[PDB]
Structures are given as C-alpha cells and as structure tokens.
Design a protein around this ligand. Structure first.
Ligand code: NA
Ligand code: NA
Lengths: 388, 388
C-alpha cells in the first residue's frame, strides 16, 4: 500500500524575474557576487532572479512526489542538508504517516538549535513530497487525506508593481474589476507614506474593499503605532509585520495599543514560533508560508489558531507552484481560514511550469483535483531544473 | 590601519580522534549509510567523525584571521551560505568595527526568519575571523580590544564519559584530585536514574564539590520538576535544559517552581533568544556556545546577563581550538563569568591542531598570549583541512 522511499533528488529552478523590482533600489545599490543586492532602506538582501528548490521523491514502486521550498538565497544550504543528512533518513521510510517522518527529522537537530531557518525549509520540501506520495498511494487529494477540505476560497491581491501612486491605484482598480475585493500594499513602495497610499487606495476602491498594510518590519513599536494611527481613518483591514520578528515585546506593545487587527507569521517555521507570540501578544491573523513550513507544520499552526480564535490568511511568494499547491491543500482543511494571498504576477507566468488544474480567478483560488498534491512540474519545467 | 578583506576561504577539518558518546551504543541503534547515527533516547543525530568548519580570512595587506563553527552535520550548509552569499558582503569591508559587519550580515536575512540555526553558525565563523584580524591589526589580543580580560579562570568537567555509575564517580574523583571543583553529569545515562547518580557523585566527591545535572531537554515541565525534586537533597549546583528549547512556557513553569538554579542556552544564537526566555522565566545561568554564536553575539549575551544578575557559564564542544580560543577571549571580559565547560576529549585535539599557548591545567583555563585570538592552525591542521 505505502511503498518505501527509494530516492530523493534535489533541484533548483532559476528564471529571470518578470516584474519590475529594481525600482525599490533608490540609493545607488550595487550587485554583489552571485547576483545579490541589499536594499539600503531595510538592509534586506534580494536576488536578481527567481529561484526555488524542488525535491523529487520516488517510491520503490515508482510513485513520484514533489516538494518545494525557498531557494532565492544560497539554495546549496537546503541541498546540502538534504543530500548529506536528511535523504538518508527518509529513504526506506514510507508515506503511511508523513507527520511521523517530519517529527523524526525535526528531532535529529532540535537540541542544537536548528529549529527553524534552512533546516525547516529543508523539512518543508520533504514533508510536501511525502504527503504528495501519501495522497497518490491512497488515491486521495492531500486535503481529503487530511479529513476533507473545501475546493475554493477567497484570494486577496498582493503586489502593485507600478512606479507612481496613481498607477498603483489604477492597477488595484483593474484587479477590483476582475472580481477581487481584498488588497494589500507594501509601505516602503509608498513615496508620500503609507497614509497617502491607503488614502488613495480607499478613494479609488471604495469603502467596501478590504485594504491591508504590510508594514514590512522596519519600525520601532512606537513608530509602528504612529503609522497605524495615520492609516486608521481609512479603515485598514489589518496591519501586517509592524515590528522586527525578534521583538516579541515590541509586537506585544503594538498589538495592545491599537484596535487595528495585527497580522504576523510568514517568517515563522513551526507552531512553537506561534506559541511564543500568542502567549504574549494580541494576534488577529496568522499568515503561514507553506514554503518555509511544510504541510505538517501548517496543519498544526492552523489547529492552534482554531484553539484561540485566530484567523488564518496564508502568505504567498516566488516559487514554481508546488509549495503553493501544498498551501492550498492544507489551507482548505482549516476552520479558521478566511482566504489566501494571491501574487498575480508570479502565479500567472508559472501556469506553464505546472501540470494540474490550480487556478485563481474572480477573487477565489480553485484547488487542483488530482490525488496527492494535484500538481507537478510540467515537461517545460523539467527541461529547466538543474541538479544541486 | 585596517586593511579591507581580500579573500574568504572555507574548509572542513575532520579529526583523527573521536569524542565518546555520552550513552553507550544500544541494541537497535543503526549506523546510517550517510555516516550518521540517531540515538534511541532523544532521537538526536550524532556523527561518526568529529568535524568542524574553518574560515581563513585574509586582508589585502595579508593579515590572516581564522574563524570556526560547527561542522559535525552537513557542513555544506554553512559552506554554501559563506561561498554563495556572505563572503561577497564581507570582501571589501574591514575589521575596524567587526560587530558592524556582523550586524549588516545578520540584517540581510532576519525578516525571512533566518535568525539562528546554520545562518548564525556561518556568521559566527566570519565574526571570529574578523575579530582575529582586528586584534592582529591593533597589536592587541581580542580581550584587550574588548576593554580587558582576566588571563585565567576556573574550568569545570562538563561530562563523565564512562559506561558505569561507579566508573563515572571514579572519573569525577580523578578530576577533583587534579584541581577541578565542579562537575556535570547527563541525567538520562544512569540505569538507576539521575537521583541515584547525583547521590553517588555527592558521596564520592564530598559536600564541597559542585555537581550539576544536565537534563537533556526531553521532559514535560511536570516530569522535570519531579526529577529536580528527587535530586534536590543532594545539593545540585544547577539543573540544565529541563524541558525542550522551544517550550518557553514549560521553562517558565519549571524555573518558577524550584529553587534549584536553572541553566540554559548552549543552543541559542543571539541575545534575542535570551530576551525571549528571561522576560518570562527565572534563569540563573546562561551557557553560550561560541561556535554557534561568534564574539559579537557572545559579548551581547554577557552584557544582557550583567544587566539582570545572571551568571555566565559557557559551553564547550569539540573543534580545532579556534572557537574555543574565541570563547576564552570573550569570556575573560565578562563580569558575570562563573566558569567555563571543559572536557579532556574536547580540549586535547587543539594541542596538535593549534599553535599558541592556550591551556587548561589544574582545573583552570589559561588564555593564550599575543594579538587577535593568540592562536592559529598548526602545520598538522593546515595539512588536514579540505576546501568546501
Ligand atoms: Na505576510
Ligand atoms: Na552547557
């Protein structure tokens, strides 16, 4: 029934970015070795390309599962973890209980403090591939295997890649006319500030639209609160990532001193990360990123949200569509799911990279139909992947 | 004058000697074909060879600094991080303000959640190399660059690698007679349990000996409190790692419900990790590991401990002697320093792998003389290093 894992193969898929992105670099920033650039304003490194890490996992019987995680930065890190260490402890196991395999792999390195970061990125890719196999072997979609899920849910527009405030609103209105009712903007994009941006968006989109602000971490708690106050006359849906990730005291302060819902969680890895915040802060929404987390982690974060009446609105990002499909599968089973980030500019071009009916239209994701993940890399994608 | 960094070279060094496991290999334990072994107790993975990652960093003027981090598992992860991402951001910088460079590197990935693990392992190795250069350029030891430190301080015996209770007591006494006054044992080891072990050690060593219990993580807070209460009559020096690292609520419960000092922190990476625990828990002792952390992080943790009256008792782990030399340099400056882990099997490799006069004799560490770290790899070590 469940055939042992025979092989674990790691790949990268690297392609040119197809969105204007270098407009964010306004301070004379220079490309560093291997194509990296640091934005001076937030000190964060960015790739000059799109890249993710893909895993092909094959049973003795020939069932092929796929997983994926972040590969934008030093994909050799995940590749080393899998090739040197983790693959050996997956091979010979089977997919009868994927979460048991995850928990064993996690346990190998937890006491040495590798409880997140690249280690969990690696585990995420293996976990998605193993659940894909489990579903295929059962003849069930992952969501079915997880107890049942819905086949569609709301999607919000993320990413307004235009140079001017005016053109950003025109882009949002274009998406509104396509049947989207929920939107998010990033505060560093906003030249006259987040208040002027939300003011424009609110005017353009009308009072019924949901308009969230991604505050993108780089504030003191006091400044975060000031900016949230400036935005609040325009009815923000939520304020996301008001302070640095490490600053739980600062998040606590922000969350207890505004009524604007606070959303966090894209950069977490496990429910343990969630526990550290919700035990201290007022968190309205969690925003898990499947590519960092894997299905086992995502399901446990979802269950913890249900315990505390916290809404779940998952993140989305640069990737081939494999971890996104995983996100949809897992998200669909969650009682606290309100909807899901939609990166139109990433999703649209990568239809070519996938076999499988995953769609997003008229403000809703439509889940794929097949057993397991329901998607796989297309023949075109297989021509592009490189071994790592 | 501080000359800009020209080159960053990454190596592994695999040792011809092997530190004992604490806990004899047991029926059913498997040597994986990948060269790793998972232990039946905590399900932590262990290597079959001791190995660390070394970094040689060279200025344009030709000053050579050395750093070191963990390499026991998947050293390709750190190597990829350094070769692909980090080295390019260090090249061109100088050692005038090593902590500024550390901060810039850390900031590149913090919003994506890479705030620890292998990322900070890699930063630790670079940070140690940069301080080594800074010292040599100033003609000052690292401790003198940091405002001055002691030239020696007490070491304690951090574990007792023998296969019986009786033999571990005899080994403790052997070290007591050779100048040691403080000892630690691992609670899962004795067949009769940790109360039986501490009772034996107390009887063998006498009232004056400090005897700590390393609880090795795998307890509920309730079970940890039960075991601590059983050991309590025998005057434990501290109870280390009573619950899982991620279980901050569990650590709070333990620390608030025993008067036995609680010690944690070898598997942390930054002062952020400390802040998350000390805000909620009663921590008596922090135990930073230089190989995971680097000088910048280690000193910040020391300063935070000083602010809160928390004792600092650093960890030690097998390596070539580079991160250990860094540990002694940084520890020597700390007002809260109350000792430092030692084991014969951990220290001994550095006698052949390092040139320099770092020592441990009669139960005390003695710091090397000379600028920077005051040590560098020996001809033997330069022979054995392999590029990665
Ligand atoms: Na997010
Ligand atoms: Na320790």
């Amino acid at each position: 029934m469940n055939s042992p894992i025979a092989t674990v193969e790691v790949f990268t898929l690297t392609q040119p970015r197809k969105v204007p992105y270098l407009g964010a670099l306004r301070e004379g920033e220079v490309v560093n070795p291997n194509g990296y650039i640091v934005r001076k304003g937030n000190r964060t490194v960015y790739p000059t390309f799109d890249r993710s890490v893909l895993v092909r996992m094959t049973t003795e019987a020939g069932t092929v599962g796929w997983g994926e995680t972040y590969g934008i930065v030093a994909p050799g890190a995940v590749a080393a973890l899998i090739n040197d260490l983790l693959a050996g402890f997956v091979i010979g196991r089977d997919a009868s209980d994927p979460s048991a395999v995850y928990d064993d792999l996690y346990d190998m390195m937890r006491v040495r403090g590798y409880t997140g970061g690249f280690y969990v990125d690696a585990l995420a890719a293996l976990d998605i591939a193993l659940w894909d196999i489990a579903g295929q072997e059962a003849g069930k979609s992952i969501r079915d295997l997880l107890g049942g899920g819905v086949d569609s849910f709301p999607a919000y527009v993320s990413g307004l890649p235009e140079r001017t405030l005016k053109a950003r609103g025109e882009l949002a209105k274009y998406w509104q006319d396509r049947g989207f009712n929920a939107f998010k903007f990033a505060t560093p994009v906003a030249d006259d500030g987040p208040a002027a941006e939300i003011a424009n968006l609110r005017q353009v989109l009308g009072p019924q639209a949901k308009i969230a602000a991604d505050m993108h971490w780089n504030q003191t708690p006091e400044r975060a609160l000031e900016l949230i106050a400036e935005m609040q006359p325009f009815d923000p849906w939520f304020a996301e990532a008001p302070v640095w990730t490490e600053d739980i005291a600062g998040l606590e302060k922000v969350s207890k001193n505004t009524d604007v819902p606070i959303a966090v969680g894209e950069e977490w890895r496990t429910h343990w990360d969630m526990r550290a915040r919700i035990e201290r802060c007022r968190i309205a929404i969690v925003q898990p990123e499947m590519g960092h987390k894997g299905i086992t982690n995502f399901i446990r974060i979802g269950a913890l949200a249900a315990e505390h009446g916290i809404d779940v609105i998952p993140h989305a990002t640069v990737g081939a569509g494999i971890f996104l499909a995983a996100s949809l599968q897992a998200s669909s089973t969650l009682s606290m799911l309100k909807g899901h980030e939609f990166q139109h500019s990433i999703f649209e071009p990568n239809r070519r990279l996938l076999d499988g009916d995953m769609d997003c239209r008229e403000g809703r994701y439509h889940l794929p139909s097949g057993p397991g993940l329901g998607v796989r890399p297309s023949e075109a994608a297989l021509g592009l992947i490189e071994r790592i």
